């Protein structure tokens, strides 16, 4: 930590300085960065805070994270910038030009996402979010309302920011954060982008660590939030996702399933019905791998994912005494899956 931590804070400031660190933006900070006069004063304070962040640096801590008061001050200034983005979202909420204001809000959201990366970089900025209005930060709560309301990519960035925040957040703090996702899962749609859904799946893995999300369960089927999300995963339309990116979203779901499998706690559940459909989707991916019959890094990743999928399928058979009842729905896939399993055994080396 110490000077190296300060350098890491400076590197986050350097990323904010870089135009733009956020994807799809020509410039970050500066003209993109900039009452409006109070916001300008906050931006000057954030620059001072960035200079301060350069000058100065358990499970919730995770990897030790440098904390800068200036970064927290920059985060408050970022919250004012976020508030202007939130105000455009609030104006949209009031509504029953504006898109340009939304684009300005989106640039602010991109800055907030860069700030979120900086918040991942700096503990103090994360701590200010952790304290919240009194909990969720008031700007963050407005951002959560904005996330419910490009904009989908910004929402995905917010979900990624929430997942980064959740790793920073204490599990009890994460539980207080948890159930925001259940409203978010309702916001999440097959129509909504798969890359955004993959970010949501990463958020779901952070949620799985949170106790309140852990209290939420696959059981209760469609009424249960987890089962409904699994059912969307089971459909796996992945229209936005292409090639490896579609596989990566499936791999992220497999990692989330693995995290559920690691947890001691983890039809009647839509997700259990979804898991047989998901296994069939994995079997279709396995059949493509069987058709491929790992020199490509993505192919090597797919082979590892297929090995993970096979372990998940073995876990699913262990999970359900009626493996066959799940199998009967997927039985045409299951005969292919058994051929795929032999191919996977051939693949294993």
């Amino acid at each position: 930590w110490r000077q190296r931590s300060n350098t890491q804070g400076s590197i986050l400031i350097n990323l904010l300085l870089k135009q733009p660190l956020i994807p799809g933006s020509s410039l970050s900070l500066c003209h993109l960065l900039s009452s409006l006069s109070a916001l300008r004063e906050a931006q000057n304070l954030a620059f001072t805070g960035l200079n301060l962040v350069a000058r100065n640096e358990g499970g919730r801590r995770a990897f030790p994270l440098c904390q800068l008061p200036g970064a927290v001050h920059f985060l408050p200034l970022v919250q004012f910038f976020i508030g202007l983005h939130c105000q455009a979202l609030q104006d949209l909420a009031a509504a029953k030009p504006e898109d340009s204001v939304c684009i300005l809000e989106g640039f602010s959201v991109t800055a907030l996402s860069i700030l979120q990366h900086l918040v991942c970089h700096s503990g103090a900025v994360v701590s200010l979010l952790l304290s919240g209005v009194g909990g969720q930060h008031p700007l963050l709560k407005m951002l959560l309302h904005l996330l419910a309301f490009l904009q989908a990519s910004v929402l995905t960035q917010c979900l990624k920011v929430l997942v980064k925040l959740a790793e920073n957040t204490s599990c009890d703090f994460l539980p207080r954060f948890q159930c925001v996702f259940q409203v978010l899962p309702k916001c999440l749609s097959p129509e909504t982008p798969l890359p955004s859904v993959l970010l949501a799946v990463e958020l779901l893995s952070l949620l799985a660590d949170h106790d309140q999300l852990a209290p939420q369960l696959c059981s209760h089927s469609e009424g249960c939030l987890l089962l409904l999300l699994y059912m969307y995963i089971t459909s796996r339309p992945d229209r936005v996702a292409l090639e490896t990116q579609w596989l990566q979203l499936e791999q992220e779901v497999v990692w989330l399933l693995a995290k559920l499998g690691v947890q001691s706690p983890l039809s009647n559940c839509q997700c259990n019905v979804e898991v047989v459909r998901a296994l069939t989707v994995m079997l279709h991916r396995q059949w493509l791998t069987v058709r491929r019959a790992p020199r490509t890094d993505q192919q090597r990743r797919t082979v590892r994912c297929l090995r993970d999928t096979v372990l998940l399928l073995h876990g699913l058979s262990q999970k359900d005494k009626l493996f066959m009842m799940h199998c009967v729905e997927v039985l045409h896939q299951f005969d292919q899956v058994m051929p795929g399993v032999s191919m996977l055994i051939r693949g294993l080396p």
Binding site: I11, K18, L21, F63, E167, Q263, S264, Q318, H332, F334
Partner: protein
């Protein structure tokens, strides 16, 4: 619990284990213990996913304790005397490294989400704490974790800092430390950089800025100029190729301003150069030249000046030029050929390639230098000079600088060879490896006709005279390349291929290249250049620089087609399938069918090589006979009763159905459907995947496509069902099982309800079942009516008018009348007057058969008059 009590017994063993963890022989035991611990973790995973998770949490607690120990080491301040009796941080680190190796495999197994980037960050901190080999072992585990995790967001700057620390280590690395350092972990970092943009475009510009700092380290630093381990030097060259050559993104980066700095870094990168990794750098320089190319179009002279300095060392003495420097001057000659006019081609050619004649004067000096060199001198260095001569031939590319210079090059190529294959002539040869001979053969092959065309024929005779190892592969390439006109003409290669049909594996690969010229590529040769657009062949030595663009009989292929065999190692058709892989053949079609039958047999199931090539062949009767041979092979696979053999046949069948528009391939799919009906697994699940692949080729309309797909083929499928009906063998339950198989076929049809799809199929099926007129089929039809639980015999009377149309559609004559009598026994009183009442559309269906019905439709009209009471 009870499991915890077993864990407690393990813990008593664990106190004994800690003594085991540090010992002279302990590290080998610890690796076995780590494998046992991984097995125990697998056993915990086997006992429960949760039990693995509880074990993972204990492992995470152990990792956290290691991280706390690492944090104390990073602090470098207080050290606990005991970290459990007596604890030694180096002894603990060795135990931790063994735990980490089990952990890295476990971490990949754990696939933890949101609890691993911190562990990766802890590993990076542990790597910073780690010194030399202990750090390298940590780095290798971290690299494996990184490959699974890509780049952690949490590692963030610290991961970039760890790369920067590696760059600092690169700037000041002991050779022993470099041996301790792992090339593979460095390779994984090189792997992490994308060859193009990809992940590197995804990778942060700030990480790229750290890479620019890394670029300042090593060769810009001159640490690369300082002696380095060759694998480490190669890794550094690979890293420059991975990122600096890729130049991914960099809009945030200085880019052209950075490129001028990069050019300064490149001058630092050249370092000693000639006075390999330099070749990789030359490839990066060629990429920089490629970057200069097009951008220059609406530097090279400096590179020429650097080349001139290498030439100046050669000019002062043959000895004065380093052999590596002579190789370096030769290196990028092909890139220079690619640069300027070849780059302009892919125009103005304002950029000028370095003159061949100035190079030729250096080459003449090099030939004098080779004469100057002592027998201890040259030798392998002379082989490098011969490679430099080969590079000069690559530089000559399409045109030799002079025919006399080409003759001088041929004399230089002859050097070791005497006769066969130049004012000095034999005397130069008198004054003068199989691979070197192969390179000389390649160079002789590269020259075509022109000066010493007879000598090139003599060189082909020399290639015939010696065919050993690489030279034999070169000799096969040389005979094909000896005359462009000979290449245009079609003749048996004979030579080694005549001596052995395989001619050995190296010749067979050369034969495969000759095969590439043969078949779909035109036998006539235009350009006749295999050079194409070669880039950099991985770590492989560049070696050789190298109707279509204008219908070939298998009989015209003759022996080469015969030479490929299941007995021949093959594995795979590879180049030999060539363009054909990408007619009135008659006996040649029969020869092609025999080659296809060998492909259908597949010496290797994996090499069935046949796939895609078969689709091109399908794009290209005898094929039906080959399909019948394939069906016989499928029968042979059933006789083999080997699942892998059956799978290879099923895969071939699936490929064939997608490959061919024609009905016989659909009939093969129906045979595949019969295979789908068969039990023992694979079968329908394999078939459904095959059907989906055929459906994707089909661009099928589903049930509307299925009706076109089925019809008579559905009747053939019904006939297979009739064969099952013929020997249902569980009484009603066996009939129900046959109905379930029919239901599975309805599920395969997948139209609306499977039963609803079946009901539409059943009216067609009932006429087909009537046409078969099996007593067992009639019992099955009654069972089917019971399974339908529908009109049944009343439905059968409605079916009978359709069945009468089916009877009109296919006529067995007197046998049909006997079948009609069998139908009449099922009919009992039968339609009678009602048949006279009906006819109409059923008669119209007989009318619809028309000319195919022919006399039978007229006979049906006479039969209709008989039914009523038309010859």
């Amino acid at each position: 619990e009870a499991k915890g009590s077993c864990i407690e017994f393990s813990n008593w063993i664990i106190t004994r284990l800690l003594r085991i963890a540090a010992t002279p022989s302990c590290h080998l035991l610890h690796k076995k213990i780590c494998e046992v611990i991984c097995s125990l973790l697998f056993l915990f995973k086997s006992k429960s996913p949760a039990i693995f998770g509880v074990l993972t949490k204990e492992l995470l607690q152990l990792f956290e304790d290691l991280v706390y120990l690492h944090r104390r080491n990073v602090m470098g301040h207080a050290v606990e005397w005991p970290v459990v009796q007596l604890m030694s941080m180096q002894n603990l680190e060795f135990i931790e490294v063994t735990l980490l190796m089990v952990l890295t495999r476990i971490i990949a197994i754990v696939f933890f989400r949101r609890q691993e980037l911190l562990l990766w960050q802890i590993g990076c901190v542990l790597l910073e704490y780690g010194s030399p080999k202990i750090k390298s072992l940590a780095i290798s585990f971290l690299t494996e974790l990184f490959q699974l995790g890509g780049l952690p967001a949490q590692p963030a700057s610290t991961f970039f800092s760890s790369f920067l620390e590696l760059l600092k280590h690169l700037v000041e690395m002991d050779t022993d430390q470099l041996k301790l350092y792992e090339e593979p972990l460095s390779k994984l970092i090189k792997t992490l950089f994308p060859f193009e943009a990809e992940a590197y475009r995804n990778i942060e510009p700030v990480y790229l800025n750290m890479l620019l700092e890394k670029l300042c380290v090593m060769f810009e630093d001159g640490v690369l100029m300082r002696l380095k381990s060759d694998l480490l030097k190669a890794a550094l060259c690979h890293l420059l190729q991975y990122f600096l050559k890729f130049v991914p993104a960099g809009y945030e980066s200085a880019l052209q301003v950075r490129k001028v700095y990069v050019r300064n870094i490149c001058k630092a990168l050249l370092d000693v150069l000639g006075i390999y990794l330099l070749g990789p750098l030359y490839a990066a320089l060629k990429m920089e030249s490629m970057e200069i190319i097009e951008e220059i179009q609406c530097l090279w002279s400096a590179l020429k000046q650097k080349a001139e300095s290498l030439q100046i060392s050669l000019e002062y003495s043959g000895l004065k030029n380093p052999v590596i420097e002579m190789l370096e001057g030769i290196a990028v000659v092909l890139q220079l050929t690619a640069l300027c006019t070849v780059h302009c081609s892919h125009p103005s050619v304002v950029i000028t390639w370095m003159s061949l004649d100035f190079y030729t004067k250096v080459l003449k000096s090099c030939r004098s230098l080779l004469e100057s060199v002592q027998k201890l001198d040259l030798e392998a260095t002379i082989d490098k000079v011969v490679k430099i001569y080969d590079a000069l031939i690559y530089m000559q590319v399409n045109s030799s600088f002079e025919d006399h210079i080409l003759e001088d090059l041929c004399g230089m190529l002859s050097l070791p060879w005497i006769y066969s294959h130049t004012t000095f002539a034999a005397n130069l040869l008198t004054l003068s490896s199989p691979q070197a001979q192969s390179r000389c053969v390649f160079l002789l092959t590269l020259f075509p006709r022109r000066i010493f065309l007879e000598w090139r024929t003599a060189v082909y005779n020399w290639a015939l005279q010696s065919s050993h190892e690489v030279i034999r592969a070169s000799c096969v390439s040389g005979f094909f390349i000896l005359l462009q006109q000979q290449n245009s003409c079609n003749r048996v290669p004979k030579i080694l291929i005549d001596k052995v049909k395989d001619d050995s594996d190296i010749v067979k690969k050369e034969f495969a290249s000759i095969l590439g010229q043969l078949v779909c590529t035109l036998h006539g040769m235009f350009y006749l250049t295999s050079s194409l657009t070669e880039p950099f062949s991985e770590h492989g030595h560049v070696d050789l620089f190298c109707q279509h663009e204008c219908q070939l009989k298998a009989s015209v292929c003759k022996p080469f087609l015969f030479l490929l065999k299941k007995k021949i190692p093959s594995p795979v058709k590879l180049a030999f399938i060539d363009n054909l892989h990408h007619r009135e053949d008659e006996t040649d079609v029969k020869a092609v069918l025999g080659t296809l039958l060998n492909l259908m047999e597949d010496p290797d199931k994996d090499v069935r090589a046949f796939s895609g090539n078969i689709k091109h062949i399908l794009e290209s009767f005898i094929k039906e006979l080959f399909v019948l041979r394939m069906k016989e092979a499928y029968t042979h696979a059933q006789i083999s009763r080997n699942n892998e053999l059956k799978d290879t046949l099923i895969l071939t069948t699936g490929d064939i159905g997608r490959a061919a528009k024609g009905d016989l391939v659909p009939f093969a799919l129906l045979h595949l459907l019969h295979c789908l009906l068969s039990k023992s697994a694979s079968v329908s699940g394999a078939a459904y995947t095959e059907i989906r692949a055929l459906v994707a080729a089909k661009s099928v309309k589903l049930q509307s496509f299925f009706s076109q797909y089925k019809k008579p083929i559905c009747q053939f499928l019904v006939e297979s069902l009739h064969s099952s009906q013929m020997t249902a063998l569980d009484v009603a339950h066996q009939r129900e099982m046959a109905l379930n198989t029919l239901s599975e076929i309805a599920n395969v049809f997948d139209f609306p309800d499977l039963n609803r799809f079946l009901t539409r199929t059943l009216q067609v099926l009932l006429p087909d079942l009537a046409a078969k007129a099996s007593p067992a089929a009639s019992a099955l039809i009654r069972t089917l009516g019971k399974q339908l639980n529908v009109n049944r015999r009343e439905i059968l009377i409605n079916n009978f008018k359709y069945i009468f149309s089916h009877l009109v559609c296919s006529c067995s004559k007197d046998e049909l009348e006997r079948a009609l009598h069998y139908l009449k026994n099922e009919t009992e009183i039968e339609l009678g007057s009602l048949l006279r009442q009906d006819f109409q559309g059923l008669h119209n269906e007989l009318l619809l058969r028309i000319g195919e019905h022919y006399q039978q439709v007229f006979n049906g009209l006479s039969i209709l008059a008989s039914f009523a009471s038309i010859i």
